[PDB]
Amino acid sequence: GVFVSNGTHWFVTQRNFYEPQIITTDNTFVSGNCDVVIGIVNNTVYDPLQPELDS
Amino acid sequence: PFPMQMAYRFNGIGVTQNVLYENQKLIANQFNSAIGKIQDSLSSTPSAL
Ligand SMILES: *[C@@H]1O[C@H](CO)[C@@H](O)[C@H](O)[C@H]1NC(C)=O
Numbered sequence: 689g690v691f692v693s694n695g696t697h698w699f700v701t702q703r704n705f706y707e708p709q710i711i712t713t714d715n716t717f718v719s720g721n722c723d724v725v726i727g728i729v730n731n732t733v734y735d736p737l738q739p740e741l742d743s
Numbered sequence: 744p745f746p747m748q749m750a751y752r753f754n755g756i757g758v759t760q761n762v763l764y765e766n767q768k769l770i771a772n773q774f775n776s777a778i779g780k781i782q783d784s785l786s787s788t789p790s791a792l
Pocket of ligand 1: 726727
C-alpha cells in the first residue's frame, strides 16, 4: 500500500483503491531508522498488543 | 512522486521498497550516469542507427 493523509490524520491504503486503514504494526514493516530515508514524516504507528499487554 | 514510483517499480522485480529509499542518492546518480552514456554511444559510432 501507500501512505496517505487527508490533511489531519495518516492512513495506509492499497495503491489502486482508496480504502484507508489505521497504520498498525502489521500493516507495515520496519527497516532502519529516521536518518537514511529522504522525505520521511513523523507520526505514530498503532501496536495491536497494547490493549492485550495492558489488559 | 518519482521517488515513490520507482519504489513501485523496484517492488515489482522482487526487491523491497526500502532498498530504493535507503539508496536513493546512489540510484539517482546511477540512472543519470547511464543516460549520459547513451548520447556518447550514439555520437561515437555512427553504426548504431
Ligand atoms: C518537496 O519540494 C519542496 C519544494 O518547496 C521542498 O521544500 C521539500 O523539501 C520537498 N520535500 C520532499 C519530501 O522531498
